[PDB]
């Protein structure tokens with residue numbers, strides 16, 4: 282018995298077709314993804330295959346002005362229109378709190394929403410009871426397929442789930458629900474969840490009874506053969522994990538931003554064992570046309586969003602590299618732009634006096650969520666900025682010891698090479714790293730633009746000197762494991778809204794040209 286699993290993860294409010302780097306589509310003839318083009322590929326498959334399951338492994342929430350305005354109503358509407366069969370809750374579905382998930386998404390979704398490891402205590406229990414489930418048993422033809430859900434254990438450290446939601450260990454929560462399914466003679470079990478390629482491999486290995494693991498969160502690109510675009514595969518598709526009980530368990534992911542539709546065809550025997558599986562993510566490129574009905578529906582919704590693009594903030598003569606393969610691995614000019622906006626807006630505050638000379642900046646590269654293209658004649662709109670900075674935080678001012686900053690720089694590359702968001706973009710700092718050294722002893726040079734000097738210049742960081750640094754409030758409060766900043770700072774003040782800072786800066790410069798200058802080097 283064959284089943285075709287179609288799957289998406291980390292769409293991140295990319296309802297419209299986007300450029301190759303998933304930023305605002307300018308050249309419509311070369312644009313990819315979007316729910317309308319996804320509809321066309323799903324329909325084509327459903328026409329040709331009788332046993333199809335369309336599944337989302339989370340993080341449809343957050344990413345573009347679609348989310349800023351509709352707060353999740355666009356997720357329910359366009360997922361309902363695509364006829365999704367099931368969706369696992371991601372960390373980003375709690376970005377607007379529990380009420381921001383319950384009221385627009387859970388109560389309007391037609392498909393089941395799953396998570397077996399989220400438990401609800403207090404008065405939330407009665408309200409959210411049944412609005413999401415640990416599993417769902419689905420009829421597929423004349424057979425039945427069980428889907429168990431999971432959600433990142435780290436969600437309270439990345440989102441706003443509140444204090445009436447406990448996030449259990451994935452494996453501990455999943456095993457009893459998989460066992461319950463097997464006692465109900467549900468022999469075909471998909472584990473659909475949002476925890477990352479690493480936890481997915483672990484779930485395939487340790488959770489007996491699981492046949493397939495469909496995942497997300499790590500934005501993993503898996504491919505068998507020649508990749509169709511710039512994404513480099515982190516392994517074959519499907520990735521095969523040999524479980525402890527000898528079974529071969531396929532693990533799949535479909536990159537992110539609606540760019541690819543994950544496609545896995547599975548051949549099962551009558552006892553629900555996997556004989557074989559094969560597939561590849563389908564690159565949703567311009568060859569596949571956008572479904573006219575979905576496009577005209579997206580366009581009707583798009584009328585409300587057109588007042589953000591209507592206002593041009595400024596112009597850029599350069600590509601604003603806000604990608605994850607640059608901003609989490611090396612110096613990217615988008616981190617440089619954000620830090621120069623942070624420092625400049627603060628310095629124009631002639632009302633204060635304590636932070637009126639701050640010239641140092643640190644910025645978590647994972648906080649930079651999108652690049653910005655320059656082929657619109659340089660034109661930068663609020664809509665573009667909204668995708669680079671969707672968390673709506675502030676730019677806080679902090680007083681740190683040199684040893685505290687040195688520890689933050691060690692932390693910045695302690696587990697380098699995993700697309701980890703803790704890699705820092707700097708301003709008024711020149712750091713050199715030697716990755717061929719033990720984690721914690723990789724900073725080989727660190728110079729900062731001094732302040733106890735009349736004519737600044739980058740001078741060696743002193744371990745016991747005090748520095749005034751501007752950074753996102755997220756870092757100021759210990760986010761990304763930057764607990765040393767929260768534990769060791771000497772003063773912490775709130776600043777202006779991150780998007781209003783960068784927006785005001787660009788309008789004042791009128792033409793920006795951030796570049797890679799040697800702020801971060803490797804030895």
Ligand SMILES: COC(=O)c1ccc(CO/N=c2\ccn([C@@H]3O[C@H](COP(=O)(O)CP(=O)(O)O)[C@@H](O)[C@H]3O)c(=O)n2C)cc1
Pocket residue numbers: 291340343372373376377438439440441498499500645646647648649671672673674700701702703755760761
């Ligand atoms: C309206 O407000 C929100 O939407 C709102 C959402 C959240 C908060 C609290 O969390 N704030 C964070 C959380 C994470 N990060 C960054 O994201 C990285 C994780 O990204 P990925 O590895 O790509 C996994 P993902 O797909 O789930 O994002 C972290 O490593 C870190 O570098 C942040 O910068 N911030 C500011 C507050 C508000």
Ligand SMILES: [Zn+2]
Pocket residue numbers: 291293340373498
């Ligand atoms: Zn995501």
Ligand SMILES: [Zn+2]
Pocket residue numbers: 340371372373475497498499
């Ligand atoms: Zn996530």
